[PDB]
Amino acid sequence: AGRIASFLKNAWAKEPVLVASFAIGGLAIILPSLSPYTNYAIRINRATPYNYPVPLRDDGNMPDVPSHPQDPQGPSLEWLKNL
């Protein structure tokens, strides 16, 4: 650890720009895999309706597909409302 400490001390005294550059790059690589909000960002991108929601022809055996938009069935954005 002493060698690493000496190297970092010398680099911070000679190339602080490079030290900061590598630190920021390393944080950029590592942090997204640990943040719990990456899945939230994915879900927010999914929740955006760019195209028309084409309806399904009811076969009488689709209990999880709402008959009307305001019916309790279907995806919920209540999590996004309070975020």
Ligand X SMILES: CCCCCCCC/C=C\CCCCCCCC(=O)O[C@H](COC(=O)CCCCCCC/C=C/CCCCCCCC)COP(=O)(O)OCCN
User: Which residues lie near other proteins (CB under 8 A)?
Assistant: 17-18, 20-25, 27-29, 31-32, 35, 37-38, 40-42, 44-46, 48, 50-51, 83
Site for ligand X in 10-69 (CB under 6 A): 11, 14-15, 18-23, 25-26, 29
For residue 19, the partner it binds in other proteins, ligand X, none, with Cβ less than 5 to 8 A by kind, is ligand X
Residue 2, H or E segment: helix 2-14
Per the structure block, which two tokens stand in for 54?
């084409």
DSSP 8-69: HHHHHHH-HHHHHHHHHHHHHHHGGGT-TTHHHHHHHHHH---S--PPPPP-S--TTS-SST
Tell me how far, at minimum, the Cβ of 57 lies from other proteins, in Å. 18
Residues at the interface with ligand X (CB under 6 A): 8, 11, 14-15, 18-23, 25-26, 29
